[PDB]
Design a binder for this molecule. Structure first.
Ligand code: 91S
Ligand code: GDP
Ligand code: CA
Ligand code: CA
Ligand code: CA
Ligand code: CA
Length: 169
């Protein structure tokens, strides 16, 4: 009854593919081709309404392309993924947000900030610092583990709720 294009972004190694493959195939990948980009589909009921999700798992290279702009423009909501043990990945979030804003030609784009790898003890990004970032962006923040599945469905489903909220703006 409604289709949603979701796009998963963030630095290399943060767990984009792991999170996506957990959601879709219900297993954790220890190693997955670091540059392949593909889309996945899945149907989910969220708040009583059937959602047909088309999920783009981004990767590729550190480069601009008009082709990438074109697929990114199709996205209706974005997961901004960092790893909680990788401060550089957190620092990179700003860039991803900016580039989304660019291609969507909009400051108000449905997004969720995702702190992945929450199962690891060696955290270098505080929950508070993320929460404050997400506050400044006006978006939710969810901590996930693709390894244990903690928060995986929540991250994706919260993004759909964000998209729904926006489509009524
Ligand atoms: C390990 C491979 C990997 O996961 N990645 C490769 C580097 N990526 C990446 N690097 C820099 N900038 C990126 C970027 F700006 C976008 C982006 C564009 O170009 C337009 C609109 C919205 C965007 F997020 C993307 Cl998709 C990837 C970028 C990805 C991570
Ligand atoms: N411990 C832990 N490792 C993870 C988690 N998510 C991803 N990884 C690992 O981190 C590495 C990169 O994951 P991947 O999904 O390929 O990252 P991507 O480059 O963002 O697509 C892999 O070794 C994964 O097994 C997580 O939640 N916990
Ligand atoms: Ca990947
Ligand atoms: Ca404009
Ligand atoms: Ca601005
Ligand atoms: Ca908002």
């Amino acid at each position: 009854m409604t289709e949603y294009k979701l796009v998963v972004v963030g630095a290399c190694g943060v767990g984009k593919s792991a999170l996506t493959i957990q959601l879709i195939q219900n297993h954790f990948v220890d190693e997955y081709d670091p540059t392949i980009e593909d889309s996945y589909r899945k149907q989910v009921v969220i708040d009583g309404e059937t959602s047909l999700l088309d999920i783009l798992d981004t990767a590729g290279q550190e480069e601009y392309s008009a082709m990438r702009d074109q697929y990114m423009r199709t996205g209706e909501g974005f997961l901004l993924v960092f790893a909680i043990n990788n401060t550089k990945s957190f620092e990179d979030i700003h860039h991803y947000r900016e580039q989304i804003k660019r291609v969507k030609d909009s400051e108000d784009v449905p997004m969720v900030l995702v702190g992945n790898k929450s199962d690891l003890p060696s955290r270098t990004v505080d929950t508070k610092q993320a929460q404050d970032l997400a506050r400044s962006y006006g978006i939710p923040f969810i901590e996930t583990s693709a390894k244990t599945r903690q928060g995986v469905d929540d991250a994706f489903y919260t993004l759909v709720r964000e998209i729904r909220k926006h489509k009524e703006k």
